[model samples]
Target chain A: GDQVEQSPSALSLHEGTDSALRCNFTTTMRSVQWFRQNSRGSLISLFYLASGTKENGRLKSAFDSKERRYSTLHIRDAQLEDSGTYFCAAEASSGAWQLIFGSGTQLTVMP
Target chain B: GDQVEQSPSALSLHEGTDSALRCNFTTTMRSVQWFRQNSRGSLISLFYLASGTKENGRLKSAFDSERARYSTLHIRDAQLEDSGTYFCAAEASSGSWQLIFGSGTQLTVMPVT
Candidate 1:
């Protein structure tokens, strides 16, 4: 059974535009982590949130502590290199530290 | 910073042949996880180990406790279903909850019959 769900299965953005991707968990999660897969298929960790929000470059991610059910990744001023598949994984609060990943959101940034 | 390194980059095998994938950690690791990225880009968790060895059918995983620096995933009797990109991730000893991943191994299993 899948405990996590990600939205915007696909997205297209012009070089300068901004967009957001989301992941909603069916159950309360201990933490949420966002990852971006490069053209070479390497998964790079963007953000790992136990709570609150974190920002890096044009990427911002937020984790809702109270709800413990969702997280969001926002890309500001999308770039050509930002085009790739993004995935969100949630670690259940059961202390298993088993991260169940979302399918992914395929994003294409056109210059 | 925690980094994980994997080797062989890719593998091709006939059905029934076997191989193993490995992950080396730069820092001491608390745990390690193995995942298979299918054709659909879905990462399915194969194994997660804190210590010792764990086996699920033909797939086996081992994590070193004393050294705490490496992990391995072994596939026995490779099948077409086993064809995929295998990734190993390690959780560092640091309090941060990030999983550092290896470069991945693309495995192709073809039927020998």
Candidate 2:
């Protein structure tokens, strides 16, 4: 069974538009990592959330301890360069090696 | 800062040939994971090693816990299905949850036999 999952498999956004991507976990996760995969299949690490929230540039991410099962990445004022696939991975409480990744959300930020 | 660097930016092999992908780490890591991205753009977990070695089918992976600075993935008797980009990620001083990933190694296996 997959412990990590994401919603809205694909999406389209206009420049300056704001949207959020979410990931759901089947069980409590110790931490979550966010990434963006380029057209060439290169993955760029965005944010690693251990708890609470973290913000960088146009992106922000939050992890809920109480809920203990999900996380979200928010993009504000999206840019054309934001067009890419976003992925979320969760580390199970069992150990850090037990990382489960979601399917991914393909976001197309059009000019 | 943590860095995970993979070798052979790209590789091509014929069926029945063998090859290995390597990852070098800047800091001691607690764990390492290898993943394959298919044409459809999905990352499939190949192997995760806390230490020592783990084997599955035609693939094998090793992680040295002591040095914790390197890991390797070996593919034997390559098949078309083995054609994809492989990435290695490591959990360093920050602990085991946060992973720093390498650029990646693009592998293409063709039928020549």
Candidate 3:
């Protein structure tokens, strides 16, 4: 069983449209991290949230500060450069700070 | 800047063979983690080491206990299911939660028969 469940196994958006991806944790997590896998097969850290929300350019992420059960990543004004797979990793409060990753959501931005 | 450098870039193995992938950190790292990305683009967590070593089944991983500068992932009696891109990520000892990821090592395991 997976501790983290990411939604929308795949997504397609237009260049100017906006969308959101989410991760639901089966247990209360200590923290959550979001990453984007680039075309070169590099995982780029987009956000590491212990709580609250964070914003960077067209990307914004939020962790469930209260419940610690879920997280979300929002993409605004999508671009072709944003076409890649997004993954969310969460650290279970009961574990030794090991990250449990989601299945990932493949995002495609159309021009 | 690339803080973590993964070696070999790629690898090929036959069933029952063994190999190791490594990651070198530019600075002292507090902890290290290993993951495998499959063809379906799913990133699976393999190991997380704060120090010393840990093993599961045919895979073993170790973190530099003394210098905290490097880590290694060893696969024994490799299977075709082990074919994937292996990645190593580390968190620096400087008091930050950000994880610096390596470029990754692509391992291709082939069947012997």
Of the true interface contacts, each candidate retains a share of: 0.00, 0.00, 0.00
Number of clashes found in candidate 1: 0
Q: Higher lDDT: candidate 2 or 3?
A: 3
lDDT at A108 for candidate 1?
A: 87
Would candidate 3 be rated incorrect, acceptable, medium or high by CAPRI criteria? incorrect
**Residue A33 deviation, candidate 1, in Å?**
0.7
Tell me the TM-score of each prediction against the true structure: 0.53, 0.53, 0.53
List all candidate RMSDs to the true structure.
Answer: 15.8, 14.9, 16.0
lDDT of 2 by residue, B28-71 (tens): 77888888865534456677788999999999999964578789
Candidate 3, DockQ score (0 to 1) = 0.04
Instruction: Report backbone clashes per prediction.
Output: 0, 0, 0
Interface RMSD of 1: 11.9
Model 3 root-mean-square deviation: 16.0
lDDT leader: 3
Backbone clashes in model 1, listed as residue pairs: none
Q: What are the candidates' individual DockQ scores?
A: 0.04, 0.05, 0.04
CA error at residue B77 for candidate 3, angstroms: 0.1
**Global lDDT of each candidate:** 0.79, 0.78, 0.80
Full-model lDDT, candidate 3: 0.80
